[model samples]
Target chain A: SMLTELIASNRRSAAIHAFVDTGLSTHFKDGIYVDISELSRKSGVNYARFSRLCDFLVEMGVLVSNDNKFRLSDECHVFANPESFESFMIKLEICSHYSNAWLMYGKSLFEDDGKSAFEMAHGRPFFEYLDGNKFLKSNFDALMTRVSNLIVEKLLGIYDFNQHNRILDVGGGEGELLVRISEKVKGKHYAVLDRYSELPVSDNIDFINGNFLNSIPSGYDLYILKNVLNNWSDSDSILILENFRKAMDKNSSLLLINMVKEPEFSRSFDILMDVLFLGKERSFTEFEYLANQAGLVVQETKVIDQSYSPYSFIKLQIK
Target chain B: MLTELIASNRRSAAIHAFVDTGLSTHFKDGIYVDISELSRKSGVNYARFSRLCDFLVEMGVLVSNDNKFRLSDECHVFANPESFESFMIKLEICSHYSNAWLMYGKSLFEDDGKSAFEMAHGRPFFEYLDGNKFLKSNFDALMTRVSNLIVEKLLGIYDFNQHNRILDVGGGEGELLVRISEKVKGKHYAVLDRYSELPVSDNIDFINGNFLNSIPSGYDLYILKNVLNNWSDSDSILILENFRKAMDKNSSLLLINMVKEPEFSRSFDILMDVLFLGKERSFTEFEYLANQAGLVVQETKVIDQSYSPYSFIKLQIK
Candidate 1:
């Protein structure tokens, strides 16, 4: 019963997000208690409709209404502010984007159609789809930037990047992580390898506009691939890793960074990505198998302990 | 961050339901279907659907053993009435509108002045129905079920004995009028609609005509329930005005619908407007419409008491 309720509540959250985005809840901003009629007038929505929306919001405890006057509940205060609203809007966008694909051809996703859900929906890969739209591209990059910061900060904290003289970040977009680490621990040669249209110009980091699957920049003692492997299939991921294997020396270590799947309460982001791009969060065994296929052996695995960190780093050496 | 989790989980559940529906739950009755069978039956790509099943299992709503999957104990609860209704309504919306809403979200809300429904379906909401019988029937039945919930509550709280002859304007199928006739005795009941779709009934008179131009006159009570929401503001006022012209001074009108609330409950109205150009109005808005129609609000009672936005209001000629 609780699980059913949880699922119901979860669905309500999505529906509520839809309502909020339509500007229905904007009239009651800043905890300002507004009469139903007043809110209806100000919001340009019908009064009974506004109240009905409020009824659902109150049911969810997102808004408090007493004697027909309503305001944001404490739980919904974040939505009242612009920054939090933007944050939520982006998250909702992400949810909408992925859910739309799955809703359309969820069955096709189970077929032998080699195309991903995103590809099936949009007629192109996720990245290419993003590339075609400027707005979506930026927002996607921003969302990834947030995820990168979460994974990278904890990633740099747990692993010893200081031991390696030179470090390379494969498929690092704009080299934020490399730049952050270079700023934190100086005198380490840091270079980023990605086919980024525009590269971040920093004296401490070098940006190479190249694909990781084709060829990787050599001469780095440590190579980092954060949030990259999941976007690709196992064969493609191993090909990318095999490229890294070719580029590095015998003593060089490859830090393959991606989400490690859990037995219980698996991360929602991982599942959503799996639905969209056919990418996945891998288990240690799965990671080991992929790494071994690429002529690499897993040396040590460190799961980042942060609550929001979806990434786990696996250190690999040439087999 | 937690909001993202909530939203993501919500989206995942929706995706799971879509998958589950495509996969069809027929195999979940103590028998298990392997991935290939599921792929064949559902016509979904096998690898992705298998991963999706694994995701749902991780989400704790399904169980997988020996590469065969079945519904979890918690999921079996959905077969119950309350849970099933909610799930069905949600799944229907998710399957029908979620993707369309997202695909054309900006156009629906913005300057393009096009509904996401039109954008997604390549036609108007009502026009698309002819080609989609299954969606249409399920959607209509779903709507009827919702209306039945409100009418059942209205029967509990509303008294029909105050008036002798009662007319139900735009009463589709005469279901509500029939249900009302069963509860209140010694009253003549009639239903007016454009189409004669109601099942044959003995106690109720079904008038098959448009209420916009004319309605049966001289009834002591006129009931306009849930039908006013599917029109433009001017049309809605005109419908109310028609009833006003047909009613005498002592005649009372019952306006039952999901009246919009102040807080954040306007989504259904917003969504309905998006799909069908129907609008939900607040009490104040409805009062204004009634005023324009030469009527005044008599009494308002929240019939259901379920914290839903649906409210019943009584009006009388001014």
Candidate 2:
């Protein structure tokens, strides 16, 4: 019962679920310590409620409060982060939203679940809601942009962009990636094919309204699918790839960049995004299976130096 | 046994007590619970009162839903909310005398015939009540609640197989008479108090007169709880004298109060005296009170401790 209270009230269940994706828990070493006031400032929750948050940790036997100061309980010393559990805390904080909604969510965790966290929250799918709810749209867009910048910002360093003639960004959101890519390699031409409504036009880049399922525009030799493809099921993914195959011909290559989930142990952040994308982030084997289905030959898979990033760029060619 | 159950959950019991105190015919058979009313009466807001309502519901005494609050059956009937039951609970939680009783609990065991009200409140029990309004209400309500419990017990314990007539001298608002009449399947019960405006009841015979002025002697069992605890030895002797004058040897007087050994009685009584201006009597003090009243301590049954730390005595004429 005490454990249930700790997990429920503290949203530790949500945290545990999310921490795997964030790689944030790995940052903690000695014992977890967090100031309640600092969390209140960031989260905009009342300071008293934060005290209740510590009650959760205390009941878990992972926190001790004395003389108005909070520290991880003696038992938490076995965990890595000694006194600095910020990364785990952030993961816990974000993942907490899931646990909050889990009570009303009708379905159990499964492989084919298409319900996103936003659906559970607003009774509408994220994309559909994003088009409608302005406040939610702003917050969701900001957070998405933040994660994209934080994670994929490093993708530019590892790839050999000098060899490519034209880079086709499929479903390129708001042209951020194309702008970033163009800035990195000046004088290189870039074209974006995404949902027409979401795209804001720019002079430097060619903005073509095209769906990846139907066709990829001509004159693009290199295709950059940064953090895409996971949005579709395997069959639909293959069809999109087949169309890209038709558009690119036999000579064109694909730069498929995605944070691949490990088959055996699910990465925490992607698993969290699985719920965000409504079961999107395809596993490594799943991606391989789809690549084969799409009739694309695996040329080479480079583990993008994650000392600086999390995604791996798969450089593939049409069979 | 039911009393003990209620006592275990003190907070729940107290909420019921408070709720019952306010609920009369005004909010019967269901009425809309307006938060504004609670705020008007309690000088708080809808939000705060709603929280209080929720708190009580959490305690399991009441159920609240959609801004409407309702008391459970037990809460409505048994709790010290209004008339009769209110005075009964007061003995344990509120009264000056009851406050003294707790001080008794803190003291070293064993002190005899010690009255705390005399010492702390600067007079005996009824005298202190006569002077103070707040203390009077507390004492009055406590007596009623206690009387309700005792009358219920006595009706259960003793077999009143023959006698139909019962006179409850100093009975608060005729509660004991009602209970006894209900229990014995008899209607011949009179609540004898001095100039007390009679509460509405069918079976109860209301007598607006003092026991000292003219006692009704034919009762099978005449019961009084904590009445003697308020008076000095001489005053108890004088009261008992009236019983001697008014009653026949065929009748009985049920004297219920703090009757304990000096070893345990003195400390309890003295401490109570300090806190409530009431005293604890030794077994001897009770014996003296009974003897001076021209009655023998017939069947000195040390009644098991009720919710409050007190006992009952049955005294009769020799």
Candidate 3:
């Protein structure tokens, strides 16, 4: 019955998400409990349906109810804040897509259907879908920026940027890391290569519109591949590494940043990638095998200890 | 990050379900398995099987060492998902309605007067199932599984010796009637459904008819188990009223259902409403309906949490 309860709870959570998406949370700007009828009239939602939503919210502890009135729970004020609320809305949309994909293509995934689950769900690959949908692309980018911003400090702490004068960030979406590195480690030139780069033109930084798989512009002393390889297949990942190998001299170092599985914690995100994009996080040994196949050798590995950052910066060089 | 984490956890849970199929669980009796062996046994491609194994290991639900994987101690509980009727409940509901539920929720509060079920299926849910045989079988299996568990508890807790002759209205497959007849001896039982060809005994009669149009009279007791919940408010009232008209002052009706709480804990009732447009009634709500049908609630007995929020109430003609 726990599983049944879990399913019910999932629906309850979905109901709350639906309610929040209705922009009804704006009514709670004053931070006071009001009657369900009043909220219903303001939001223009049917009282019965609104009442049901509130009942579940109260049960979920996101909202506290007194007699016939309701207020946002103290910890749940995020829904009342436009910034935090937008983040949650983005999360809900992304979660909906992934969960729906799992329900649709989860069984077929193990059949070796030769199509990623995302492709099956969206009629194209994950990246292609994002490229075509502006709203989705923005949310995806925002989420990446939010997560990467958290890791920037820890990443700068562990990896030495001063050792290399010229550094190239391959597939750096918005150059968030490059901006931070330029601020922290002075007198170094930084170039970010992505399909779409919005990083401002700067004295020490260059934004290049390009693909990492095809010609990563030859002369940088250091190449950064962060959270990029996991989105690719083993063969395609080798090709990516080979591209970097072709562009780099023997002296150039490569930083392969990705998630390394922990023994105790759940690999929730990794499993999600397996369903969402047919991608996965590799263990250290798995990474070693991939690197070896690409004629590269890992010289050093450093982990950034941010809770959400499963990232490990594996420094490598041409074999 | 929280959203991504939530998405990942949902997939992780679904991954467990996909791998915990009958074939996989058969090999999971506290023994380690090679990826290839599991792949062959479970009919999954080796590469994909290996990937799922790694995911489960990361999920802390499975242990992997030296290319061998075993179910963790925490996952032993899921070894026999068949015995846990609740597993099927979640799996069935999720598999049937998750994708449609999202779209349905998007347009729900616009006052369209169309149930989300109709919007998702392009037809009423029950009617849609009538044409889709595979889905119909799944729906039947889930209902039967839940019904069996609820009936087991019903028979255990409720006293049925007071009546000799019983009629089960709208009872599909007649399993509940057969179970009850087998328990109480020398009692005549009849099951009314749209179709017959169910299991039959000398004392048991399977009548082919619809409860909506009419009911056969002369039974001292009527049993409506897990049936009324599927109807809309008007249809439910009509069914209850028909039963009331068929019964004499001396007869009693047993309405078996899962009661809803106004607030507190996650209610499967509300979720079912999303799928079937079949609302769950609290005790007061049911009393109001029964009162509309000129029937008074005699006694309410709850078989609390045997599997779901199931209960049985006795009603009599007022």
Candidate 4:
């Protein structure tokens, strides 16, 4: 039960805490060895607490403690950036809060009439709250933006997008992926269609300040639905996909980038996303069912390899 | 959704993984931190991976790394001998799974049912094959090692020679009785436990009975070691009554268990509370139970110390 609790309680923070507490990251980046006294001071922990923190970190493989010399292990490279570090820190902070906050995560299913996780945890939908709660807004934006950017990088590596002349990024936040895509293909005309509130004057990309259902963007070679349809139920997902289907030309490609649920190894992130997003991380079967109802034909499927999930890419063509 | 999240979730994994990896130990003073070899070993791409290193550098978990990685200021405290890491008996406490496993056969309560020995195959737990064989052996070895560690302190702190007749109730293997007999001259040390459980020891007399079923009187001291966690509140009360009926006005009882001030001690007590589902008690609670049994707390002693915090309580007849 201790191991189970340890694994469940920390979930992901274990790795970061191990490396961070051990002072390996500090020594590696600063190029200065930290003595026990100095480390004790910097961490604001007693020498005893700090040393135990190091033992845990050493166990997790971030650093090595040896005959009077503490050194960074080779594995510390995976966590190599401020963005990733911040991401991990935020998630850890959130996860620490989750146990107490998300006690009602399963309340809806069991209770028959349950509030959404956002409502259950914090008593409000995340989107409705961002403007009023600055810190929540900032953390949510950072997490979403980081996730989108990472997915974009993986998409660039695994897929071919050079053939498309124009890209319509649906529900694209601040045009992060659009900028990445535009930068990769210099002559491409790209546009993001979302609320004017989601885009401010500082954003450089051309934006349509309206709902995709109001007037769909047309004649684009590709309608990239990156994490767009997943927030809704399956019926709504089909309706949205059908709307896109009616707008796109016969040859235009519909790149559906969302969390594809692999029931076998999906590992409860599906449940998490479902709780948070009110959407299912659909499997190929579910996706096929929706794509069938929408009259979209699948061209290819690709699974991107990273340490975590939302792994597969489903490419659809309008039939 | 799985792949989408996994790729997107790498940064999260990195931070979580970093904590588990314990890289912070190596943040020695004035050392260049390099993670090239670690990267090679883990098969992560460096160009893409340097991003995570850069992040740690910013968060101060790691120092700057051009070719290598090192520890930052915030990570070095946990590596020293004085650090709390060394004193983590709470961390050493077996998780819920192991506790459940230990109680697995006990719950069955069938005489023919499997013990840890049978459940672990036909062989006993001592001989069972396990990846953590060393840890397992070390754990079982606690009974003897801890006794050895504490006996000298027990000798130094308390006077056992004052009592002519000392009964080590529930004494396993009579090792404690032997030690007591060897230490204090002119005293008779008798080991009272299930007869079958006693090892061959001619120096100490052995009497067999389940503590609740029967008890023999006339000893000046009756010492119970690491018992009472098994029974419920009612059962414990009954056992104490049996002890009371077996003793006269001069008898004293020495009960050994974990002890601490309420606030400081609850972490271990609470864990054992979960491990045994409230059958265990904190020091204060133990005192409460002893009082309810109409006994008086005379003195408490910390014999020798242990990696864990366990103590011996000496209670006189009320």
- Return the top candidate by lDDT: 3
In terms of docking quality, model 3 is: acceptable
Candidate 2 reference-contact recovery: 0.00
Candidate 1: Cα lDDT at B19: 36
lDDT of 3 by residue, A254-297 (tens): 98888777665555556566665677777788888898998898
RMSD of each predicted structure: 6.2, 21.3, 4.7, 18.6
**Any runs in candidate 4 off by more than 4 Å, and if so which?**
A1-8, A11-34, A42-45, A68-73, A78-80, A89-97, A112-114, A151-154, A195-198, A201-204, A210-216, A263-266, B1-318
Task: Evaluate all candidate structures by whole-model CA lDDT and list the values in order.
Answer: 0.67, 0.54, 0.69, 0.56
Model 3 residue pairs with clashes: A267-B58
DockQ of 1: 0.22
Q: Candidate 4 residues A233-315, lDDT tens each? A: 67678888888888888888888877676634533444444445455566767787898899999899877765555465788
lDDT by residue (A1-319, candidate 1, tens digit) is 2443344444454445555556555665778887877655565555654465566567667778888788887666656653443444434443555556655445545456567766776788787787677666665566556556656567667888788898888877766677778877888788888766776688878788888767987888998887887787887878988998899888899888776776654555565666567777777788889888889988888777545434567899887
Which residue segments of model 2 deviate by more than 4 Å?
A: A1-10, A13-125, A152-154, A196-198, A201-203, A263-280, A305-310, B1-318
Query: What's the CA error at residue B150 for candidate 3, in Å?
Result: 3.5
lDDT of 2 at B240: 81
Give a tens-digit lDDT track for model 2, residues A213-248. Answer: 777776778887766676554666888877777777
Compose the digit string of candidate 2's lDDT tens values, residues B102-129. 2332221224434433443456555566
Ranking according to TM-score, highest score first: 3, 1, 4, 2
Name the weakest run of 10 consecutive residues (lDDT summed) in model 3 chain A: A85-94
Displacement of the residue A258 alpha carbon in candidate 2, Å:
1.6
Which candidate leads in TM-score?
Answer: 3
| Candidate no. 1 TM-score | 0.72
Better of 1 and 3 by DockQ: 3
Q: What is the lDDT of residue A104 in candidate 2?
A: 21
User: How many residue pairs clash per model?
Assistant: 27, 46, 1, 120
